[PDB]
Amino acid sequence: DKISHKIDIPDSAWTIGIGEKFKNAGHPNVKYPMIDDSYVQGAPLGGFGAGTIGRTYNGGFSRWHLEIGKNKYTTVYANQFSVFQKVEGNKDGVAQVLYAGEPENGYLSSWKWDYPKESGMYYALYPNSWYTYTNKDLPVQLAVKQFSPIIPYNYKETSYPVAVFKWTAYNPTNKNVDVSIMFTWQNMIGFFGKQVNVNSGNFNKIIKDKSKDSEIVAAVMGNISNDNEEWNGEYSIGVKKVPGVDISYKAKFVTTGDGSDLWHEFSKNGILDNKDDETPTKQDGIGSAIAVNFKLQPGQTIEVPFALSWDLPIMKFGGGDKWYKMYTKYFGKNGKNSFAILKEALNNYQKWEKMIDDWQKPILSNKSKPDWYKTALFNELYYLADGGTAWENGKVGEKRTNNMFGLLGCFDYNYYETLDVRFYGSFPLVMLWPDIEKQVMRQFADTINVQDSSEFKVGSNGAMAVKKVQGMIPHDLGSSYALPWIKINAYDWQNPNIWKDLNSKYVLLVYRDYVLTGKTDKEFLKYTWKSVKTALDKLKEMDKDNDGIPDNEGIPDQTYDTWSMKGTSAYCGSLWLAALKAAQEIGKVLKDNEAYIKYNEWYKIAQQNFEKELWNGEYYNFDTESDHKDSIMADQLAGQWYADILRLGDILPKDHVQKALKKIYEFNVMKFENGKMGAVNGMRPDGIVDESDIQAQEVWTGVTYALASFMKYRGMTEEAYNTAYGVYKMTYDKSGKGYWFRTPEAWTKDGNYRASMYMRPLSIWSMEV
């Protein structure tokens, strides 16, 4: 490996061998069907709301999130980079697809598949990833850096449906070598969204943009139809000329054939026919190829940028609504703009690399923090783009000031902005994209007094319940299978209108978003103030025994939605105390004296009673009335955690908080698989895991990272990082369960999982406050 020194991969990048087999991988631990796409994954390409494309460590374009809200795992075999090399003085060269695998059937059988093991590495530090190719039959060593311009405090480039591939080639040998690099792409119009005739009318054109000291050659893969539909638009691939390289191309090869129409050209001398051909296809799949060829002398290095764009302007949800994607603000809505997007990327990628370095540097250059923590911190952010992210620039047919946004809680439970989850998972948005975060919270504010009296069947018990009650915060803002932003509370496993955490979490989210953006945005507090008061006042009515605290009803009426709470719970009770304190503070800021006084009175009664009812000498009891009321809950002081972040002070005595955190570390972490797997949710005082429900026996990745944050602010530095380390280990390490780029909600002691690709572990960013 002589290529690594010619590029700059950070030491904290997650790494794996190209073609590496992983033997320890986990699988779903539930009885019902659940997504399991294997450990063959990688860092996604594509901006927020653009649709994303997962290119795996093996080289394949395999995890398709282009249909917004859907996850489709299938390798499109025509989508590859290939290499040709010929040593000066040999008769023949060699050609190889840079993919550690081969197709399942006979399409593209002529290509050279099965890139060999032990011949290259994959590296990821989101939003960048890299592949190196150090192969004994390839005398020139190659590497590529691939990325999309995901940039904090930037709402423009961050939205683009574009990827850059910056290639570096180096000749360490003592002979001249001819090298070609070829990008192939299938015209994927009709891959989704088209009910019949899936390739019909697809056609490919070549654009040569020559303008002084710039040459771009690109393929635009579109359809003859000008229909404005979810399925229609363009894909583009291309390359920018640099000194010392020639460009060649082929507009049309057949993907549903043996591939030899292209491969016979590339395998001879790495130079394509330059055959333009705009003939549309009927039933056959088609694609395009863009290639560079160059001669490398001994010791010579060259850099060449390629790019990929996709202009699919319309997203459609299962309920029938069609919206424009955010990026259409910058490029247009007509679906004929893939080349403009590609050209912007090819002409500006160096600036974008620097912008990315500028935001990663403060963390990467802090040598008090271990590399493993940086690996997790950056790579967990994959989910902001990969979580079915929806970001609208108008409904099709209909202009507003704001652009509505939604991130899925996960794919198995397909709900937007699941609020009990975003309490943990929204930290990256408030810290790095606060205008999106405040938009999402205004979306929730607007729903507070919505009433929907129609009834749905509650999944857990079969009872009928009202869809949406006035004054109760919704569980979510809809499903991608239905109508995001329009029909809320798609979730139906329990009735969220009787949940005891949603209304408090909502208030705490609101005050967080003011505090973490500088305590300046009074207009945001004003917009949300009525909803905050309404939310707290409605939750107070759920206090059954006049102790000043809402009563859990002996059912799972909160985020742990199979784990029953009854009476005063540590979890919902602490959240209530914190929410009251936040509302007092907002009352002072806005000069609402009667609110300050009311919430101050409620707070002091509830605080007293919380302490009397739950404090046992060592920790706070799980609740006042359940069968395992004395279980040690990992999340027992969630309200005090948020109070620390919000700078609201002590809601409970410092001494008791410290004792409770130490107990949690001693029990829920250290007595669960030797503290190498996170914090198990429920432990009995005898040190055996609580067996009252599956969720008690699960480690929750986002709860664990948030508990790490809490420990860190309380000066328990070693405990904090050791607690977090088990999550990192299980997710990324060779000794873990293979969950890189699909961090789940939960695992049990055997390491098997529930709900891969989950929002909650984005809470690792609470460790950076």
Ligand X SMILES: OC[C@H]1O[C@@H](O[C@H]2[C@H](O)[C@@H](O)[C@H](O[C@H]3[C@H](O)[C@@H](O)[C@H](O)O[C@@H]3CO)O[C@@H]2CO)[C@H](O)[C@@H](O)[C@@H]1O
Using CB under 6 A, list all residues that contact ligand X.
31-32, 413, 459, 493, 561-562
Residue 520 DSSP SS3? coil
Q: Which residue's entry shows tokens 């002091």? A: 604
CB contact at 8 A, 651 and 660:
no
Judged by beta carbon, residue 147 or residue 700, the one nearer ligand X is 700
Judged by beta carbon, residue 100 or residue 549, the one nearer Ca ion is 549
Residue of 230, 265, 547, 690 that binds Ca ion (CB under 5 A):
547
CB contact at 8 A, 228 and 396:
yes
* Contact positions with Ca ion (CB under 5 A) in 551-570: 551
Backbone angles phi, psi at 427, to 5 degrees: -55, -45
Distance from C-alpha of 680 to C-alpha of 690, rounded to nearest angstrom: 9
The pairing of strands 245-254 and 162-170 is unpaired
547 binds, among Ca ion, ligand X, none (CB under 5 to 8 A by kind): Ca ion
Residue of 549, 555, 586, 699 that binds Ca ion (CB under 5 A):
549
Q: How far are the Cα atoms of 214, 278, 422, 466, 543 from residue 511, in angstroms, in the given order?
A: 50, 57, 14, 29, 23
Residue of 36, 543, 625, 768 that binds Ca ion (CB under 5 A):
543
Judged by beta carbon, residue 176 or residue 562, the one nearer ligand X is 562
Judged by beta carbon, residue 200 or residue 748, the one nearer ligand X is 748
Judged by beta carbon, residue 327 or residue 411, the one nearer ligand X is 411
User: Does 532 help bind Ca ion (rule: CB under 5 A)?
Assistant: no
Judged by beta carbon, residue 234 or residue 551, the one nearer Ca ion is 551
Q: Which residue's entry shows tokens 């390839």? A: 138
Evaluate the CA torsion angle 415, 421, 427, 430 in order and state its sign.
positive
Judged by beta carbon, residue 572 or residue 706, the one nearer Ca ion is 572
Report in angstroms how near the CB of residue 9 gets to ligand X at its nearest.
38
User: Does 623 help bind Ca ion (rule: CB under 5 A)?
Assistant: no
Q: Other CB atoms closer than 10 Å to residue 640's CB: what's the count? A: 27
748 binds, among Ca ion, ligand X, none (CB under 5 to 8 A by kind): none
Report in angstroms how near the CB of residue 412 gets to ligand X at its nearest.
8
Report in angstroms how near the CB of residue 691 gets to ligand X at its nearest.
15
Tell me which stretch binds Ca ion (CB under 5 A): 140-148, 236-244, 550-558, 645-653: 550-558
DSSP state of 593: H
Backbone angles phi, psi at 315, to 5 degrees: -110, 140
Distance from C-alpha of 204 to C-alpha of 185, rounded to nearest angstrom: 11
114 binds, among Ca ion, ligand X, none (CB under 5 to 8 A by kind): none
Question: What type of residue is 336?
Answer: K
Upstream peptide bond of 127 is cis (omega within 30 degrees of 0): yes
Report in angstroms how near the CB of residue 568 gets to Ca ion at its nearest.
6
514 binds, among Ca ion, ligand X, none (CB under 5 to 8 A by kind): none
667 binds, among Ca ion, ligand X, none (CB under 5 to 8 A by kind): none
CB contact at 8 A, 287 and 210:
no
Closest to 561 measured CA to CA, from 672, 421, 430: 421
SS3 content of the chain, % helix, strand, coil (to 5): 30, 25, 45
Q: Give the residue numbers of the binding site for Ca(2+).
A: 543, 545, 547, 549, 551
Report in angstroms how near the CB of residue 726 gets to ligand X at its nearest.
22
Question: What type of residue is 659?
Answer: K
562 binds, among Ca ion, ligand X, none (CB under 5 to 8 A by kind): ligand X
Judged by beta carbon, residue 411 or residue 732, the one nearer ligand X is 411
551 binds, among Ca ion, ligand X, none (CB under 5 to 8 A by kind): Ca ion
> Nearest 5°: CA angle at 440, between 515 and 596?
45
Report in angstroms how near the CB of residue 270 gets to ligand X at its nearest.
52
Q: Give the residue numbers of the binding site.
A: 543, 545, 547, 549, 551
User: Does 698 help bind Ca ion (rule: CB under 5 A)?
Assistant: no
**Residues making contact with Ca ion (CB under 5 A):** 543, 545, 547, 549, 551
